[PDB]
């Protein structure tokens, strides 16, 4: 099974640096060029860089001079060092195996055909002047649930965090049915906010506790918050 | 010689066919191999067609590729709902000495039934108000098609400042979800009798209303 497992990435300031890495297995590494292709949020694909088996390196015009690709054929590893980062560098980055092994033709050695049959899982790179910020977690409960309401929506507001992503579970992953965690909104301040909601039976309130577990890895923050209705 | 031009969107009927075009120039599409990629929501791209019209191992023959002059086309027959994805063309440009991607084409499969949105409105918590702030949360889910309008009202008056609404995004059940946040001071929240989130979908408007709680 072919695998390209990426690591690195994260958040940097304009002018800062980040290193991406890609670990390859399941094929003859030294026979193929390996590329980096990126994709801005909600945007299209753009080829970033390539390194050949023999160490030949090529880069897109927008990143030439700022990015340095390298590989280790004995370790089956690849790395992309990214300096002088700009706002427009914000994207998910994939390592991508060239679908065509290097070949000799017409007097020249060719590194590949710039088509990509296997792709890594993708690593998020954010470049922004805002610093990392953990979220504030607030409970979302109705002001007063009438008896006619057999069910009740409980939730957690995960407010004013940066950068993405955030994960939410309920009762340490034991509550999954009826859970809806919404994609975050981007505020004008440059911070994100999301909400997670779960519909539970009203007869369970006062009998069952409902705790939301919020994980913001970019700030190394975890928050557990119990949600009750004050009625 | 340009960036490959694809239509932003395309649609087709289930069990029928759709054709996604990709226009370039003589230095890319006209003289070089064309490749096609499929990208499902939240996933990495997948090689769908290579060398103008060849199918990789495991790609069904209902996916076909073709080239004509400075244009290329990807045809999908026997359309399934799982085919909803972004489709990208790609080709080498020898004038630019660069590999090019098209802008992508979002494929919609028609026939999915319309669904009215479920709307839940949350007032601010006592914690946040203790911090002198008040965020009102309007959660909209389970609607199709993915287009809603969100209006905020305060005791009948229109609320324009402090509103931030997400773009709709597909859920796991192929329906859509969205969120609207109304950021106020505690002074604003406590100087009104009620606030309302009004969600309009397909001309039908639903309304939820929250009010400062006396609790006593």
């Amino acid at each position: 099974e072919v695998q390209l497992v990426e690591s690195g990435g994260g958040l940097a300031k304009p002018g800062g640096s980040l290193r991406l890495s890609c670990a390859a297995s399941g094929f003859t590494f030294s026979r193929y060029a390996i590329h980096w292709v990126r994709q801005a949020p909600g945007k299209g694909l753009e080829w970033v860089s390539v390194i050949s088996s023999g160490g030949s390196t090529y880069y897109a015009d927008s990143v030439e001079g700022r990015f340095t690709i390298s590989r280790d054929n004995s370790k089956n590893t690849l790395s992309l060092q990214m300096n002088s980062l700009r706002t427009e560098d914000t994207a998910v980055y994939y390592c991508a195996k060239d679908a065509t092994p290097y070949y000799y033709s017409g007097g020249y050695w060719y590194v590949g055909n710039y088509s990509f049959d296997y792709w890594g899982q993708g690593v998020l790179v954010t470049v922004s002047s805002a610093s990392t910020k953990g979220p504030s977690v607030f409970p979302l409960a109705p002001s007063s649930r009438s008896t006619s309401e057999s069910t009740a929506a409980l939730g957690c507001l995960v407010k004013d965090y940066f950068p993405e992503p955030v994960t939410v579970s309920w009762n340490s992953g034991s509550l999954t049915s009826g859970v809806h965690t919404f994609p975050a909104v981007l505020q004008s301040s440059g911070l994100y906010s999301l909400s997670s909601v779960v519909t539970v039976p009203s007869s369970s309130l006062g009998t069952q506790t409902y705790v939301c577990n919020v994980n913001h890895k970019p700030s190394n923050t975890k928050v557990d918050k119990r949600v009750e209705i004050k009625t | 010689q340009s960036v490959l031009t694809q239509p932003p969107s395309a649609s087709g009927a289930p069990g029928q066919s759709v054709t996604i075009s990709c226009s370039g120039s003589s230095s890319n599409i006209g003289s070089n191999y064309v490749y096609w990629y499929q990208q499902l929501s939240g996933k990495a791209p997948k090689l769908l067609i290579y060398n103008n019209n060849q199918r990789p191992s495991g790609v069904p023959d209902r996916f076909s590729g073709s080239k004509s002059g400075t244009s290329a086309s990807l045809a999908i027959s026997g359309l399934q709902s799982k085919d909803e994805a972004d489709y990208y063309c790609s080709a080498w440009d020898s004038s630019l000495n660069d590999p090019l991607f098209g802008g992508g084409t979002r494929l919609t499969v028609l026939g999915q039934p319309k669904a009215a949105p479920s709307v839940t409105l949350f007032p601010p918590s006592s914690e946040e108000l203790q911090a002198n702030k008040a965020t009102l949360v309007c959660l909209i889910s389970d609607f199709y098609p993915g287009a809603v309008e969100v209006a905020w009202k305060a005791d009948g008056s229109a609320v324009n400042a402090g509103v931030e609404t997400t773009k709709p995004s597909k859920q796991s059940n192929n329906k859509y979800a969205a969120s609207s946040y109304l950021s106020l001071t505690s002074d604003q929240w406590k100087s009104h009798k009620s606030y309302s989130c009004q969600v309009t979908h397909e001309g039908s408007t639903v309304e939820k209303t929250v009010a400062p709680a006396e609790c006593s």
Partner: peptide, 16 residues
């Protein structure tokens, strides 16, 4: 310069 992104330019591949 790097006028052809398809070419391997390691001298070991052509003169070794």
């Amino acid at each position: 310069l790097k006028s052809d992104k398809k070419i391997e330019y390691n001298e070991t591949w052509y003169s070794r």
